[PDB]
Amino acid sequence: YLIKHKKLNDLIFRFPQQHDVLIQFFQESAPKYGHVAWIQQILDGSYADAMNTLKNITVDDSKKGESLSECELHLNVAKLSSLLVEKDNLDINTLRKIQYNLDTIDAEKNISNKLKKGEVQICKRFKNGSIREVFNILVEELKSTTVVNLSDLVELYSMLDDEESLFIPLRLLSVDGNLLNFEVKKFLNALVWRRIVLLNASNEGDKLLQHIVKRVFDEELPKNNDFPLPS
Amino acid sequence: GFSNDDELNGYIDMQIGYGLVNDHKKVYIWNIHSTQKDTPYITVPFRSDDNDEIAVAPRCILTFPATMDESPLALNPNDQDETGGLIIIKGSKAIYYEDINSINNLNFKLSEKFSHELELPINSSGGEKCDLMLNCEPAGIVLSTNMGRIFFITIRNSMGKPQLKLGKLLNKPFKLGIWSKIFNTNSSVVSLRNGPILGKGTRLVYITTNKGIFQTWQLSATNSHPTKLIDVNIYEAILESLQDLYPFAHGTLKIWDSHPLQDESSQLFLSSIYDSSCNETYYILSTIIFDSSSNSFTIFSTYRLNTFMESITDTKFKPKIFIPQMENANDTNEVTSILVMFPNAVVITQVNSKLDSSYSMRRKWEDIVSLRNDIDIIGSGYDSK
Amino acid sequence: EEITQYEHLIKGIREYEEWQKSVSLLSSESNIPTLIEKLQGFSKDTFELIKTFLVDLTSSNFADSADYEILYEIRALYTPFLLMELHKKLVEAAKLLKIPKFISEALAFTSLVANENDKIYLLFQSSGKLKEYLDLVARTATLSN
Numbered sequence: 001y002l003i004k005h006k007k008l009n010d011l012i013f014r015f016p017q018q019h020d021v022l023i024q025f026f027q028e029s030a031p032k033y034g035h036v037a038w039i040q041q042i043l044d045g046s047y048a049d050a051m052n053t054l055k056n057i058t059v060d061d062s063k064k065g066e067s068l069s070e071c072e073l074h075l076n077v078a079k080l081s082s083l084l085v086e087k088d089n090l091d092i093n094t095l096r097k098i099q100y101n102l103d104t105i106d107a108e109k110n111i112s113n114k115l116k117k118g119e120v121q122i123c124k125r126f127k128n129g130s131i132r133e134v135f136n137i138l139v140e141e142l143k144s145t146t147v148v149n150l151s152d153l154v155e156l157y158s159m160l161d162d163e164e165s166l167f168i169p170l171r172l173l174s175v176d177g178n179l180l181n182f183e184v185k186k187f188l189n190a191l192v193w194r195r196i197v198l199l200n201a202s203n204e205g206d207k208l209l210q211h212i213v214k215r216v217f218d219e220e221l222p223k224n225n226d227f228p229l230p231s
Numbered sequence: 232g233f234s235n236d237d238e239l240n241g242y243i244d245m246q247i248g249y250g251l252v253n254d255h256k257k258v259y260i261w262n263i264h265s266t267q268k269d270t271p272y273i274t275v276p277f278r279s280d281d282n283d284e285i286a287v288a289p290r291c292i293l294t295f296p297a298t299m300d301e302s303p304l305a306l307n308p309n310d311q312d313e314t315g316g317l318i319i320i321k322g323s324k325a326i327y328y329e330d331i332n333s334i335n336n337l338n339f340k341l342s343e344k345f346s347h348e349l350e351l352p353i354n355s356s357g358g359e360k361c362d363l364m365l366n367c368e369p370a371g372i373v374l375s376t377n378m379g380r381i382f383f384i385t386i387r388n389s390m391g392k393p394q395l396k397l398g399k400l401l402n403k404p405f406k407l408g409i410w411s412k413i414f415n416t417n418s419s420v421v422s423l424r425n426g427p428i429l430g431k432g433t434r435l436v437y438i439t440t441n442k443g444i445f446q447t448w449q450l451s452a453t454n455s456h457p458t459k460l461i462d463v464n465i466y467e468a469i470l471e472s473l474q475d476l477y478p479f480a481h482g483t484l485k486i487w488d489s490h491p492l493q494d495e496s497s498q499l500f501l502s503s504i505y506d507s508s509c510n511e512t513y514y515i516l517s518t519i520i521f522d523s524s525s526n527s528f529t530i531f532s533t534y535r536l537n538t539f540m541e542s543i544t545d546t547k548f549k550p551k552i553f554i555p556q557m558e559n560a561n562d563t564n565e566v567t568s569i570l571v572m573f574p575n576a577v578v579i580t581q582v583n584s585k586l587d588s589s590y591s592m593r594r595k596w597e598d599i600v601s602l603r604n605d606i607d608i609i610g611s612g613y614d615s616k
Numbered sequence: 617e618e619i620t621q622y623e624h625l626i627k628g629i630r631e632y633e634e635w636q637k638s639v640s641l642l643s644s645e646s647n648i649p650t651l652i653e654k655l656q657g658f659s660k661d662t663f664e665l666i667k668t669f670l671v672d673l674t675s676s677n678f679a680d681s682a683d684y685e686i687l688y689e690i691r692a693l694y695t696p697f698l699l700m701e702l703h704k705k706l707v708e709a710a711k712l713l714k715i716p717k718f719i720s721e722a723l724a725f726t727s728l729v730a731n732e733n734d735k736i737y738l739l740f741q742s743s744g745k746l747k748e749y750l751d752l753v754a755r756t757a758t759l760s761n
Contacts, residue, residue, distance in 0.1 A: 080730035109343035
């Protein structure tokens with residue numbers, strides 16, 4: 001009631017003995033009082049309620065997306081508000097995520113444009129990749145000036161892989177991959193290795209073998225342990 | 232009448248016909264092959280969506296169109312519709328910007344789709360920073376680092392459509408003890424000069440380092456190991472040869488630039504000799520012919536500029552020779568005119584081809600066009616005569 | 617250049633003092649437009665002076681040498697002091713005049729604090745004033761209640 005009726009002084013200080021229930025209230029997805037609600041929550045040293053609120057903000061096309069100028073502004077304000085997390089509520093991890101988020105949209109868009117211009121490459125299997133027979137279809141529908149088709153963008157994004165993004169799978173399995181199970185990690189790592197040793201043997205010029213091996217030493221992949229070299 | 236940074240990196244791109252000077256906050260791009268003296272000024276602000284790592288200073292260089300019809304020539308009456316793609320190096324990220332005219336000032340999320348990013352190798356023993364960029368398309372971009380690492384980036388994949396894929400390091404980091412550039416092929420690149428367009432997706436690229444190592448790299452767009460045609464140190468040879476006609480060329484030798492002649496196997500080397508009986512510097516034009524057909528070399532002629540005995544070291548960059556390669560008709564290719572570019576004179580000469588002993592190897596025609604000290608070379612390109 | 621840098625705190629205080637008088641003329645004890653005119657003069661002055669000081673410092677080669685630190689310390693003093701001073705005003709205006717723009721103007725100084733101009737939001741944290749400043753903004757809204 002209070003959060004709606006702009007009675008914020010009464011909420012914290014006049015009823016000091018229902019506090020424990022008030023932690024339940026914070027755990028709400030949004031308290032109800034609109035987009036002015038979340039602001040109040042950053043202000044009180046009651047940040048935990050607001051992080052959860054802001055999620056509902058970013059899917060509303062009427063709170064961001066009124067116009068271009070206002071949209072860019074809103075994104076700035078959310079970021080700045082994140083900076084004002086103290087130690088009251090340990091939303092420091094969320095703070096980092098809000099910052100990360102413009103870089104995330106760029107990664108998304110980046111890869112999307114490539115796929116639109118036939119960024120996805122032909123499958124190695126045979127003369128042409130079967131995936132493309134699917135990839136082309138998804139590009140065209142979205143190339144037509146018509147309504148945004150959410151499903152089409154999701155499918156399109158992952159299916160055909162940037163060669164600018166092959167390094168991250170190798171990095172990830174070294175650092176994090178013993179958690180997935182050795183046997184999983186070994187399998188994926190072995191897949192890439194196969195292809196690498198399937199070219200040096202074809203001809204006579206190796207130098208292929210060391211580049212992948214010596215390459216993992218630069219970022220200390222062996223030091224991460226259990227990471228084999230091309231073999 | 233723009234804001235000026237302390238650092239100004241220019242390159243004139245005659246492969247596309249657009250002119251560039253860049254700041255390290257913005258790039259200013261204009262149609263320099265226009266038929267009117269006046270030109271529009273495309274200003275492109277730097278992104279904060281983009282990612283950037285280590286100390287690498289922003290060099291910006293133009294690249295072929297990719298959303299607009301391709302320019303394999305300098306082109307356009309004054310259209311800004313055909314201004315190519317853009318590559319800006321921020322850190323370890325080479326970022327290629329597609330469109331640059333549909334950039335709105337109240338949205339920046341349409342800029343995102345035009346940004347493609349690539350991570351270039353990290354771990355260096357003598358550091359990194361983009362020093363020179365030479366558009367040597369058709370093939371791609373070769374960029375030099377001050378340490379002496381040399382990176383080839385193909386801007387197209389194999390579908391002939393845009394994608395950055397790192398081709399190969401021409402020069403790799405030497406992690407051999409002690410030296411990092413001190414006793415290797417890596418040292419400070421002093422020239423990145425285009426060599427002839429032999430077609431077939433190949434471009435000769437001449438690489439001359441400060442030590443006096445001459446490297447000829449036959450680049451081709453697709454290559455996981457480019458072939459080096461020439462690899463000889465010529466510093467010793469020059470010093471020796473200048474004792475047969477000049478008896479005061481004893482001591483002090485600097486190699487300043489290398490640039491191709493009309494003949495592609497023949498390279499002109501810019502040198503200085505110091506006369507210690509008068510404190511004069513005679514700039515010596517040396518025609519050196521390279522055999523890439525045996526990886527051998529011979530010095531053909533050494534010519535001393537006889538009326539030009541000034542010591543003139545350039546205000547911006549080090550002394551450069553220019554001999555613009557042929558691209559248009561021009562009657563007679565047996566004599567070579569050489570432009571020696573300094574910010575206070577242009578010595579125009581022509582050097583021996585006669586092997587006269589009845590007129591010596593110098594004392595031919597020499598003319599000087601004196602300039603003022605307000606020439607500050609930001610970048611240079613050539614094509615035609 | 618020294619005179620310019622030192623003057624910035626002082627000019628804002630001079631306007632501040634004129635405003636302390638104006639404070640006693642709030643609550644419709646002078647016509648409302650004259651009080652808002654004075655108020656606009658004062659708000660903009662203080663903010664402007666912060667901005668000016670930042671620019672001067674950064675591009676005089678004092679952010680390009682290791683003498684910087686004495687200046688940073690000077691900035692530390694100026695920024696939270698002026699910002700606070702300005703922020704505690706407008707709260708007073710909001711109750712006395714009963715106009716929500718001043719609820720907005722109080723709230724608006726929170727965005728300046730979070731902007732990086734030598735990381736103003738760290739100074740406030742460090743000093744322990746960030747919560748104090750935050751709670752005041754909330755209470756401005758409670759004035760319409």
